[PDB]
Each structure stands twice: as C-alpha cells, then as structure tokens.
Amino acid sequence: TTIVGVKFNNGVVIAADTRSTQGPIVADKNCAKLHRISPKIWCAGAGTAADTEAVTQLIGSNIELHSLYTSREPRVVSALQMLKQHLFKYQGHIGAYLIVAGVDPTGSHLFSIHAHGSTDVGYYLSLGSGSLAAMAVLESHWKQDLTKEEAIKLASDAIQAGIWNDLGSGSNVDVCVMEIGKDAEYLRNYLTPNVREEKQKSYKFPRGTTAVLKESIVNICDIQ
Amino acid sequence: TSIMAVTFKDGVILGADSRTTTGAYIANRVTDKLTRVHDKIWCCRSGSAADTQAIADIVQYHLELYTSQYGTPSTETAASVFKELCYENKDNLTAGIIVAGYDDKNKGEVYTIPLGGSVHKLPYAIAGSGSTFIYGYCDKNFRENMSKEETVDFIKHSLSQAIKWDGSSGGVIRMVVLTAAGVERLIFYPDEYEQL
C-alpha cells in the first residue's frame, strides 16, 4: 500500500498503489486509495482503510459546512488541526496513518499524519508497507525548484519501486495533482504496467451439468 | 532526543537536533522542535510527540486569551500552565520539555519540566533520551553573563559532542534567540560540525 506525496514549485501531487489485503491474501485488484475532503484537497490513508474512509468522508462534511458558514474557501490546515484533535481522543485504536496535501488561497501545502496525532511537514513523503523503498528513490532524484511534469514521473517511478521491490503492493497506479488557480486534475489508472494475460484455455462448462433438486420463482410484486 | 537551552547577558537561547525515530528508521530528518507559544516564549519538545503537539497547542489557547483579558504574560506563568497539564495527566502521556522567555525588567529565564511533572529553575538545561552524554562536557565549560558569540558555539560544541560519541539520535542542528530587541532562527549544517 505504497503511497507518496511531493511538492513542486507551484503545486503538489500524490499517488498510491491499488492492492488490497485481508492479510496476505488479496481482496481487490484495484481500489481508489485517494480520497476527498474538499475539491482542491485530497488525502490518502495507508493502514486500516475503514478508519481511513470515515475520516475523509466525515471531515469533508464537518468542513464543507465551515466553508459556507464562513463564506470563504477552506484551508487544508483546518483539515489537519481537527483530525489531529480527533484521533488524539482515541490515542491509537484508530488504524490510520495519512498524508494530506492541497491548495489554499495562501499557497500550497503538504502534511503527514500518524495515529496518535504526530503530524509533520515536508516537501516529500511516502508511507505504507513500502514507505522505505519509495522514500529512497525520490531521495536519489528529488531536487529543489522542481517542476510539475518532473514529479509525475519521480512520484510514479518511485511507487513502481513500491510494487516490484515490495510484497504487499500490487497492480495499478492512481494519481491526483493540483496547481494554483486551476482545477484538481485526477488521473485514474495513470499507468497499467502489468496485465492479467490469458490462461491457455477456457475451463468453463456446458449446459445440463448440475443436479437441481427443485426450482421455483420469486416475486417482487407490488400493490397490484 | 537532544535539546537544551541556556541564558546569557542580553537574552537566552534554545537549540535542538532535527531528527526523530521510530524503531531504528530515519523517518523525518528535518523536524523542528520549537514552538511559537507566544511572541517571546518558546519551548523544546522532548519525550513523545503526539502529546507535546497538543499540549503546546493548548497553551496558546490559555496564553492567547490571558494575553487579551489580563495583559502581557510572564514566563513563570507558562510552566505553571504546562505543569498543570503534565502532572494532572501524567499517567497516560510521555513528555518532558523546556521553556524560555524574557522581560525587559527581569532578564532571561529558563525552566525545565520532567516526565512526572515538576518545574525547576535552571540557567542551563538539557533533555533527551540521547542527551545524558553532556552533563560533564558542559558543567565545566559553562559560566554566566557571557554573550552571543560565546554561547552559540558552546551549544555547537555540545551537540556534536552528543552525536559524535554515541548520541544515537540527531541530525542537523538549529537554534533561535530571544533578546530584548528581536528574534531570529539560526541554522547550522552537518558539514560544519561533522569535520569539527
């Protein structure tokens, strides 16, 4: 579940593997790790995904009200100092370990979060099972005053390391990128590097094979 | 992990090593550990991190209204706020920290706070799981009423004395300053004190 975040000169970007696990066994070929709290803002949680999605679709509701009540655009920092206070109430039973990055009228931002509430900042981050490998790639390529289309590659090839050079990762890549004074581009399935090729035949069956004891119809009828 | 603070003639100083750890992985190596709790009050977050963030972020709330209602604060007032959160809730969290401030009338002051919760007066103070390696290499080099140039390197020669011989947790070094005139974040880099 290798994700990644990185800032550039006039915007930020994030990415994420699309491998699910009910342990070692997979349970979804692909799943949008990326989630929304607001249009410009986006976040990705690696850990217990059920505790990932609550906070997104929750905080995206406790803040959408705030924007309208304030008659003003949000700020991402507001999306931090409330969930930072939320998780600390529970002191770690929550299975959450997040990044979050976006855009606000005062600039751009990236932030990282852990469960107890230990938030930190930086121009580049990477989490999940492959937080190790994916951080090293971009260390070997990150520069100051980078530019947008240099990061889509640096951020994608990094988590390609989080696939091949890691176990629990998987197939595809999902990317979302922002930029000031512009909408939030959302790249779904930005690259499909592997493809489930075809086993050498069809192991199907023809009609009239099984043994059906009885049979009957069901109605979903109504008031007539 | 490795933080300390010292007073001098025309003000005081804080400092720290921008490094963290979980297990034995370099997670975030550029971290700040100094808090704008008020204009001329600061601190140093030693111990856990999930606790000291929230703790410090509270103390703004009580020092941002005490700023408003009742006047500009004093530094003695700060630790007697930190102390009341750390003593009364000692058996859940893990934090031990430092403060610093200044009045034009009463010169620089530095208090300290252990885990269990107890303020103390000190001119020089240290804290960190990996900063007990300095109690000798400072008690002899240290004096009072010195100045900016004399105490900056004093810190500098200490933290490398920590990290070189068996510090086990530190990165770059940074520091600040709290005179009567103003403040300024400083920054010193590995190549400086590494070859030192």
């Binding site: 900042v121 121009y123 | 550029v30 700040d32 704008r36 990165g171």
Partner: peptide, 15 residues
C-alpha cells in the same frame, strides 16, 4: 543533501 531544512517554519501550523 541537508540544505533545504530551513524553509520549515514549524511542525504544521506556525509562522
């Protein structure tokens, strides 16, 4: 490679 740790004014918020 540790020359960019200067534009970090704090631990998420302050300025």
């Amino acid at each position: 490679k540790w020359d960019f740790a200067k534009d970090i004014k704090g631990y998420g918020t302050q300025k």
